[PDB]
């Protein structure tokens, strides 16, 4: 029943910089807090127990402190191998994980490369029509995509998916798919995806005409 508030839930940090995560508990946990690193496809790895005790082999980059209800965890000299999700765990009265902090790499801003694609003829023979928009290699991850049909905005039937931070250049990419019926699709002419991103005050606009 002990509640744990871990903050921030996500953090962009610079290589070589320092990051600090805090965990606040709903009552005194008497320094029984531990910290874990979690990478995809791996088991959680114990870094610290009893607030500040590092496990053997854990680099000196990692440290923890606190008491009562307020704890903190820090990574100094951030390295690429430290990019992971981190969790605190109170183990004073049963067990409660904090909500996690997903750590990502800071880099220079990059505008997205935007590409729009009409539905294929194959898909139309199944009676459906998906319009696809790729928004590739941008930074930071925050981005909004708008679909417009013959001028008016459409929100129903849109599915979005984002890649994780790119292993080649640490950018993000995103796919947006607007799915309509074939009959719906052939009732309109102009289809547009608009990308709004901090790299420009003006959105990036890509479109096609169904009859062109």
Partner 1 sequence: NKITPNLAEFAFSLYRQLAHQNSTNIFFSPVSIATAFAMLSLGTKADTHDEILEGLNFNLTEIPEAQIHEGFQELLRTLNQPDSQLQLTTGNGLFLSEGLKLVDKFLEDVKKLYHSEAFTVNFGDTEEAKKQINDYVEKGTQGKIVDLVKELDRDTVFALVNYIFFKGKWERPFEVKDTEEEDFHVDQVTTVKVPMMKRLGMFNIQHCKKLSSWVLLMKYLGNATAIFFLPDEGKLQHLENELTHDIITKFLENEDRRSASLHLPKLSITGTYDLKSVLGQLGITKVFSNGADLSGVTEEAPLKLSKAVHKAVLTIDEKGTEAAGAMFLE
Partner 2 sequence: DVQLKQSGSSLVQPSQSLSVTCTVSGFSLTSYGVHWVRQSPGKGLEWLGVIWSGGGTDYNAAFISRLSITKDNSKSQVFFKMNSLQARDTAIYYCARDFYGNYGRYTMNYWGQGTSVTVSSAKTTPPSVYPLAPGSAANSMVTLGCLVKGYFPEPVTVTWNSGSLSSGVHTFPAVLQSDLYTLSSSVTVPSSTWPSETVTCNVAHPASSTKVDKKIVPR
Nearest distance in Å: CB 30, partner 2 = 9
Handedness of CA 133, 165, 74, 4 (dihedral sign): positive
- Contacts to partner 2 from residues 96-135, by CB under 8 A: 96-100, 113, 115-120, 122-123, 126, 130, 132, 134
Residue with tokens 């909004």, as numbered in its chain? 144
Whether 15 contacts 32, CB under 8 Å: no
Whether 24 contacts 90, CB under 8 Å: no
Terminal-to-terminal C-alpha distance of the chain:
62
Whether 59 contacts 74, CB under 8 Å: no
- Tell me which stretch binds partner 2 (CB under 8 A): 48-56, 140-148, 181-189, 197-205: 48-56
Does 46 bind partner 1 (CB under 8 A)? Our answer is no
Does 53 bind partner 2 (CB under 8 A)? Our answer is yes
Contact residues for partner 2, defined by CB under 8 A: 1, 32, 34, 36, 38, 43-44, 46, 49-50, 53, 85, 87, 89, 91-92, 94-100, 113, 115-120, 122-123, 126, 130, 132, 134, 136, 159-163, 168, 173-175, 177, 179, 208-209, 212
């Amino acid at each position: 029943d002990i509640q744990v508030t871990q903050t921030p839930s996500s953090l962009s940090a610079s290589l070589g910089g320092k990051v600090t995560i805090t965990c606040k508990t709903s009552q005194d946990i008497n320094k029984f807090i531990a910290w874990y690193q979690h990478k995809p496809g791996k088991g959680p790895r114990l870094l610290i127990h009893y607030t500040s005790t590092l496990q053997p082999g854990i680099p000196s980059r990692f440290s923890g402190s606190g008491s009562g209800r307020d704890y903190s965890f820090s990574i100094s000299n951030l390295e690429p191998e430290d990019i992971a999700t981190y969790y605190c765990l109170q183990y004073d009265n049963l067990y409660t994980f904090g909500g996690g902090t997903k750590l990502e790499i800071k880099r220079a801003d990059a505008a997205p490369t935007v590409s729009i694609f009409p539905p294929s003829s194959e898909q139309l023979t199944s009676g459906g029509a998906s319009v696809v928009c790729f928004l590739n290699n941008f930074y930071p991850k925050d981005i909004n995509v708008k679909w417009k049909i013959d001028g008016s905005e459409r929100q129903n039937g849109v599915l979005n998916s984002w890649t994780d931070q790119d292993s080649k250049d640490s950018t993000y990419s995103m796919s947006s798919t607007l799915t309509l019926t074939k009959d719906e699709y052939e009732r309109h002419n102009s289809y547009t995806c608009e990308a709004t991103h901090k790299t420009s005050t003006s959105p990036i606009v890509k479109s096609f005409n169904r009859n062109e």
